[PDB]
Paper text:
A large subset of alcohol dehydrogenases belongs to the family of short-chain reductases/dehydrogenases (SDRs). One such enzyme is ADHA, an alcohol dehydrogenase from Candida magnoliae DSMZ 70638. This enzyme was isolated for its ability to reduce several ketones with excellent enantioselectivities. ADHA is a homotetramer as typically observed in most SDRs.
The purified enzyme crystallized in many conditions and the enzyme three-dimensional structure was solved in the apo and NADP+-bound state at 2.0 Å and 1.6 Å resolution, respectively. Although heterologous expression of ADHA is good, the melting temperature of ADHA is moderate, with an apparent Tm of 43 °C. If stability of ADHA could be improved, it would become a very attractive biocatalyst for selective oxidations or reductions. The obtained crystal structure of the wild-type tetrameric ADHA allowed us to predict stabilizing mutations through a structure-based computational approach using FRESCO. Because the energy prediction algorithms Rosetta and FoldX do not accept non-proteinogenic residues and because the ligand-free enzyme represents the physiologically more relevant form, we used the crystal structure of ADHA without NADP+ for the stabilizing mutation predictions. The calculations for the 4503 possible mutations were ranked and mutations with a ΔΔGFold ≤ −5 kJ mol−1 were briefly simulated with molecular dynamics (MD) simulations to probe the flexibility of the variant.
Residue numbers in the entry:
A (entry chain B), B (entry chain A), C (entry chain D): 7 to 246
D (entry chain C): 7 to 196, 203 to 246
Write the structure that this text describes.
């Protein structure tokens, strides 16, 4: 019986790769973000490997906190999900003194406030459902959340925020059969990696990480039962 | 002359205790909080130990990001401060499912959004002033930011956000002669740690932490020059 | 081509589970420990799934630093290995005051000194060999290396030492095509966690962790290419 | 009334700076180290500021685990101490492949094995002594124990080992009135261009002693590291 996964930012980059992997594994994947044409294009490519497995699109403005918390427009009830991958995020680089208020505040809402609201919505809906195997909530974070760099003050803040949220949720939700973790990418070949590149950081493994490396970590977590409250870092050694 | 320190949440508890020690060390202290009456009382209490040391109040609503970012109502120029202690915060305890949106959203604002704004104003105003000794920006975090607990989801996220902000600022502002750190209190005796008490945690050292011990850490940091990107944990071993 | 994996402490519990899983992936596995009969029984069970895949035993006293350092008695030279999993270790519980000297010194040797020698030999043998994909060095650590508990002082030291070794080696060897990581199990069903059980720790996920859960993280790492200098924690939330 | 503090490696660099500052605060400092001539020079200059304060030297081979363990040749019994600062340690830089076995084994012994033995002897002697404020056990670690760099494999291991010891001890001994912490220096004058540092330059020894002193006067800090590393671990 195909389990349901929700992947925000599922239409591109890391989130696409995740959704593709979870679909290959038999998960009924809902992919959520803004662009309806992009979502549909990914949904067509999602493998269907088990009978009764169905994919879905959710046109969701990732910066609208009330939409996320109300789960507005979603193809399924929040209570349907056994996997939620919060991959939703924006990156911005700037010295803090020059960081435009509309920008950093938007970044904070996309990366932190909205996922909090989404997460509440999911947990309320699935907490007391019977299980036998844990549900999983997995956030995509970043090496910058744990090892500081110049010019990413607010970016770093938003995703360190997510790390602290994960750790507390893990403790709270563990007794309810929900496991909660982060996957922390380094510099990965995507957009929002537009501008930044690997040679800007002191990496033990030089060069780009491909998107499928980050999805391998998500898949590993989804299949696991005794991992909660952790980060799986896929960063070419940035945080070493 | 006597260096200027700004301390938000300075009108009671930890921030009062931090302002008292700073005054005692000769700092001219600006104290900011919503409650003008409580502010004026604290101001009257602050030691005056050398000539040309002067203290001030700043009625500042800690939940107004715009006000905070514009230094609105401030009694001195943002450029005057050589020490900024971002002590402002709210703590709320709730299962995440049951956490009222208005409550957790105000908490994030007070604990993270507004301090970012306020930090941006200070950094903008002081980054270029010349120094032979570092200036200091010190955030007050919590043990819960690094070691997860039930029922403190958003609280933990806000303060781990501050931790992430801190590390990245430390990197960015280091070569500018600004040192950036956190002090992380455990369960401290304040009308603030309300209902929740030391027995509720696994603690190597039982009992309450007095506000003066938090202030001790801040004072230590203010007088240091080679300490940046770090947390001083005063938590009775909570994070051990 | 079948790659060679060396797995110390390979004869039971976690080590046996890792060896079984690597063999099922097509690795030629060398399992090394003191007890020959147990060794041979495990070897006989290792899957043989492809051409050119051979398994071996290496009777090695994991307390003998010189023998580890010189590959004394080993069936293949150090230069053969693309994977080295250091699972070798002893645990002991005692208040520090009462921890008998011979015992804790022997634990230090088995858990830290001998693996450092073993690692030195692998690294010196394989460092200049050419590689398209990275070689892997993986240490088995413990949640206790990162979160403190009573009565495990020297045990925690030994395994934290391993963690510290891992991060530095990761930086050192990354440019040589060798990825270095820890897997950190929690309380795991083995005749090794003797005396100690899960109930003595504050765990979000109650109960014993099965040896396969630890092997799964090892297998994940071995199949990856962009993970280095990290820990993968499989601890039912102990470190959360 | 002046309390006894033990500071190993107390004759040079960071240890001397620590011995000096503790002496300035009222502590009777016993300093332990191999170099007996330098021990006396430093004992000669330690501040006297409190009635009854008296300083001591202890000739100790910091590699002799058994002498550490048994307080061999010490001027005071282990029971006398309310503060123990483990400053004791050797650093060595080498590719792991070329790191001489006698060198790295001896570093491990000095940095880890012998400090465990010493800690044991102290904890055994003081755990049951009544206390109004807590005793202190403070290890000197290094930024490299938490953040990896090349060519410092074993050194990093030895000092992360200390960190792991510190965290368990802090949980074990907190109920007995013993607080246990690390101070983690960066590159301290005793090179900084090796590392990515938000603050450029050397750290002076007194900045490390400042941390120790802060720890010593505190009551509610245990299980932690105070990092004075110019931002190395940021």
């Amino acid at each position: 019986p195909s389990l349901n996964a929700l992947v925000t930012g599922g239409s591109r980059g890391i989130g696409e790769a995740i959704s593709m992997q979870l679909a290959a594994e038999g998960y009924s994947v809902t992919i959520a973000s803004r662009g309806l044409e992009q979502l549909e294009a990914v949904k067509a490519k999602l493998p269907i490997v088990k009978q009764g497995q169905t994919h879905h699109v959710w046109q969701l403005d990732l910066s609208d906190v009330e939409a996320a918390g109300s789960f507005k427009g979603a193809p399924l009830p929040a209570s349907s999900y056994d996997v939620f991958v919060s991959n939703a995020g924006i990156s911005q680089f700037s010295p803090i003194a020059e960081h435009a208020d509309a920008d950093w505040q938007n970044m904070l809402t996309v990366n932190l406030t909205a996922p909090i609201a989404l997460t509440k919505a999911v947990v309320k809906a699935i907490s007391d459902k019977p299980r036998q195997t844990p549900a999983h909530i997995i956030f995509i974070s970043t090496g910058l959340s744990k090892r500081g760099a110049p010019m990413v003050g607010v970016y770093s803040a938003s995703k360190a925020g997510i790390d602290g949220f994960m750790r507390s949720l893990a403790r709270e939700l563990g007794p309810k059969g929900i496991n909660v973790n982060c996957v922390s990418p380094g510099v990965t070949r995507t957009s929002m990696a537009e501008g930044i590149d690997p040679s800007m950081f002191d990496l033990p493994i030089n060069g780009w990480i491909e998107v499928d490396a980050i999805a391998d970590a998500v898949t590993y977590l989804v299949k696991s039962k005794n991992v909660t409250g952790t980060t799986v870092s896929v960063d070419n050694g940035y945080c070493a």
